[PDB]
Structures are given as structure tokens and as C-alpha cells.
Symmetry: C3
Amino acid sequence: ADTIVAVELDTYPNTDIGDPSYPHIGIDIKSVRSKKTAKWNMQNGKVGTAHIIYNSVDKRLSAVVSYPNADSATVSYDVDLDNVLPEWVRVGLSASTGLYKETNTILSWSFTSKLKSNSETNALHFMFNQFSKDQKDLILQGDATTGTDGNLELTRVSSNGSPQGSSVGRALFYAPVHIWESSAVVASFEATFTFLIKSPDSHPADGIAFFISNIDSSIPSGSTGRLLGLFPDAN
Amino acid sequence: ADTIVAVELDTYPNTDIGDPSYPHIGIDIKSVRSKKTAKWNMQNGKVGTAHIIYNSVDKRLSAVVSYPNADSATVSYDVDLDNVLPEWVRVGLSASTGLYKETNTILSWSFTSKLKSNSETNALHFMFNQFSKDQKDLILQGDATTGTDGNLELTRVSSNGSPQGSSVGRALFYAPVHIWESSAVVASFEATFTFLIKSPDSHPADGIAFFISNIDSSIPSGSTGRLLGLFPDAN
Amino acid sequence: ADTIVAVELDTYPNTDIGDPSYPHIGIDIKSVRSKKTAKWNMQNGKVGTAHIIYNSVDKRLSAVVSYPNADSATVSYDVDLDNVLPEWVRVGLSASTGLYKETNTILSWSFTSKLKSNSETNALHFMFNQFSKDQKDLILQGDATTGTDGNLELTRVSSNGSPQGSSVGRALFYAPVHIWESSAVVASFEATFTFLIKSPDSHPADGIAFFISNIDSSIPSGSTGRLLGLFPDAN
Ligand SMILES: [Ca+2]
Ligand SMILES: [Ca+2]
Ligand SMILES: [Ca+2]
């Protein structure tokens, strides 16, 4: 029912549902099967940084994932977002674990959105660097929690710090985002998040996604594991 | 969620979402991107007439838009409607304005529907020539109002008579329409409306559409402007 | 809205919506227009048996329909079910009549499901041979009733025993069925039902279907006749 446009940071190869046989970064339009993929050297217990860029003039959604003293992964896909998405949207961060487990910790999250009309510019900008327990400007869904160490824990984490299996969680910004109207000439957004993925066992599973969805968006049933908390099925 | 079959009278070229670079008439099946288009000479402040025809033997939806002492536009598309639509439907008129503004005035609206079984015929026919403030046989949605001058004003119009921007309105007939059952051999409908599109500025925007939808049809969120009050997105 | 995967037992040729010009058995994935069909010699007033087989290793849904001292019909299609369907599902039996009429009597219904994980095995098995009026492990929908002669009557049957036209009925098992989670290596199901189709007139209509759908599944509006109580439209 819900329209999903996602930038995907994928840690587990799910070759059964069209993933490549390595950890990867993907662009998702209405489907878990990514429209474009790039090879991604995932680093266990290291702080990574993701940048997401789109504008309506380029008609391209672009993504870059970097680790310090390490490789950088880059993905781009030609997509017209006001053609795909409704007038008003909600932006968020989503994560999942399956059988294999990982921490899906967000250390910081910033987002800027701009909409230019025919005749100065309309803008929204938010910045999180510390997350509060009483965080009224976020819609927490599923197993997602804020407050421990000043961080957003999207998947379930025990008292000691070890990741829990079969978890799903999303955090969405409270205010709806304006991506198009009839008067619009230019539309753009920039998204930035720093993340920590650590796993005790050999294979970490599934990962984190930045997503754009319609205002009334909720976690689909059984979207744990490979479906990343975004899609009800693997179509 | 809603299945839409529309004949659109499109006044503004939205080349961004698949429109030709002129005012046009189109046949819409589940999408804003018309399946067939024809060039239409829109006349500002003039009374026009639209005729819409379909039967299940032809398997063709056809439309003709005419102005007095002027050009006539013709569009036809091969479509099987009982294959596309449910057993029971609601018929309506829809209109929108964006940044640019137009009056979406309906002066008269008539509709006939016929369903033929094995071994005479089942029929529904309604005729509006004057519209009432107390109009219980219509479902008014959005900015749609009846009563001033005996006309249906689909988009918002001020006290003086000037059209208002960013408006959306639909009028639907109260009784559900039977378009097929298992016993059926022939199914047909004829639709007719007279309309007034006037604009003070150079470019009138978006226009009027006749539509067929499932019974519980509602105006989608952000279907102002280019989406004509019919579609949630531009897919 | 609902995802439907059905094994179809089709008695009436609806060539208008993509059926072959004979009684047939089909595999339905999201659509009434079968992905694979086989010719099936329907026998009026005779007890038939259907067997449905699928496993995730084969990636094939197969079906066999047999009558005593008569022809056997066989259909197979390459399909990945956990790619198509959600994690948790409900299994059921569905039937319809149109203008022409048939009894859609189920004499017995058995279903087995298996889910094998990384580490023995998770399983569900139910067997019906006699049906009760007070049947709490079934969700009866539409015109479907249990109790007459210890049988499930999916379509409406009169006091004397003659089939009634324009009927629709479904029976679903109460407990949800697990067909995948991430830990899974192999998932399988076997379905079996015995059936009685009798008609006084020359043409019996539409028939019975075994189906897999999401947990909250209900009968679509106007899914009588050709649509088999499964699909809202003939897409
Ligand atoms: Ca994956
Ligand atoms: Ca347009
Ligand atoms: Ca049929």
C-alpha cells in the first residue's frame, strides 16, 4: 500500500531475492530488488558515514558510504521523485536483523530539504547529534529506541551491548516534508547519518536504510531480516 | 488503492509527467500518463461540450470535445472495461487547479448506462441541466459546490467570479452503476457534459475529467494540479 | 490490496478474460489470468480428488486432479513463494457460481506445512474428513456453510439439494501458517481435498480453488462468477 523510495546499506547477501554475493549499497524504488548496486566493504565495529543527495534538475538519487582510513562506495540511479512520490512525504531511518545479528546504531542524523517556487526558497533543516529519551520530534516505530549513550538504537540491544536477533525498527521525523507543488521549479534534499555496525559472529545481517515514504507510513508485517522494515514482500 | 478509468480534458502541458506540449484530450487507465492523446484547441470563456461513449462489443472508449464555430477533437482507445473495473462502480466529474487558475464550471451533466442479460434490458439514466444547493443525488467532494447560477463549480470560485488556485473538487452520482455480471452479453454507457473554462491570465491550468471508479472513491492526498484529483502519484 | 496465490479448478470457459475454451486447471499468481493451464475433463456428480504440492528447493507449485476410472489432469509452474508472499499467511478453499450453477461441496480437506531451520523441524498438519456446524478452527466467509451431511458447502445449496446461482464462499484455517523466516533452509506444503461438482443444466460454472493469502484476507466486492472469490478485477 505504501510507496517506498530507499537508499539501502546492505550487509547480508540474500542471493535468493536478487542481492549480489557480497555486502552492497543499493537504490530501492518500490521494491527490495535494488535498481542499482555497488560493492561495499563493511567494517565491523567502525563508525561509518552515509551521504544521500538528490535534485529534480539532475533527476538522480546518489549515495556515498565511507569509513575512516578505508574504502568509499558510490551508487547513482536516474529517477524522477515527484513522478514517483506524493506531494507530501515523511523521511526516516530503518533497520533490521534476521537470524544473524548486528547493532544498528545511529550516532548522528541530519537532513535538509529545499523547494523553489516561480517568483526566495522554502526550506526544512534538522540536525541530530545527540538523541534524547523524550524525543518528541521523532516517530519511533517497532524496536527503535533513543537515549542510551545519546544514540538511536534502531534494532534491539541488550543491557550489556550485544545485538538481538529478529529485530525491526524505524525512526521518522515528526513534521511532513514538501517535495513538490504546481509552482515548483527546483526541488532538492541532502541526508547525512553516522552509523555503528558491530557483530560478535562472522556474518552481520541486513543493515540500515534511509527512506522516503507517504505521511501515514508504518512497519509492514514480517519485514524483519532481508526486507529491511520497508517492504511486505520481495517483489 | 482506487481503480480509475478517466477521460481527461487537459488544459496545461505537464511535459515533465508525459503530457504533449499543447492542450489535449486523453484516455486514462490507472495512470495520469494517458494511453491515447489528441490535440485540443481550448477556448477561453467559451461553452464547450464533451461526449463520452463505450460499449463491450466494440471494446473501445471514445471521446469528442466540441466548441461552437470551432475545431472538434476526437480520441479513441481499445479497452475492455469489465476486465479492468469491478462489477459495481461510481461515475463522476473531477477537476483541479494548480498555480495557474481556471473556472471548472459544469452547466449540464447527463449519463446513461445499459446492461443486457440473456432472454429486455437493465438501465440507469440521469440528467442534470440545473443544479441545486440541496442536491441529495450527488456526492460532493473537496472544493466542489452547487447552487450559484444553477451550476456545478468543481474548483473554488470567489464572490466576484474569479477562479482560485490550488483547488480540487469532485462530484459523483449517489446510486452505484452496474457495468457487468456473469449473465451479461452487452454493456454500454453514454456520458455528456457542457462546460465553461475561463481564465484571466494567459495560461489556464489542468482542466476537467469524467471518471469511473469503485464505489468508495475518495480524493487522493496531493492530487491538486497536474494529477487532476484522480491519482495519488504520477506513475 | 491482498496477495493471492491460487491453484484453480476451473469449470466454465471465460475466454473474454483469458481462459481456454474448455474446463481447465490453472496456477494463479496475483491474477485471474492463469500463469499455466492444463485441460481437465470435469465429471458431473462424481467425487474428485485434488493434490497440491510445493517446496522451496524445487521452486515449483504443482497440482493433480483425478476422478475414479477416468483421466488425470496435471499442471506445474516455476514459482518462488517466499519471494511473492509475506512471512505469515492463511490457507483456504474458495468457490463461486455465476448465472450457471454447480455444487461446490468439499468432502474432506487436509493440509501439511513444514519449515526447516539452521539447527529438528517446525510443522503444522490438519485433517478434516467430517465437518461440524460448530467449527471453530475454520473461518467461514460469504455463503460458505458446514454441517449438512458432514460436508463443507462453499456455494449456497437449497433444502432439496439443488445449486443456487450468484453465490460466493470461502473457508480458511484459523491458525496462521509459517512459510518462511530468515533462518529457513527449506519450506514445503502439501494440500489435499476431495470434492463433488454436480449441475442439473448443461454448463456447470466456475469451480473451486485452493488459495494462499495474507492473514487479514476477506472476499473482494463483486468477486462472484469468473473471479472465483479471489480477485476484485480481471487484471
Ligand atoms: Ca540483504
Ligand atoms: Ca496536464
Ligand atoms: Ca472460468
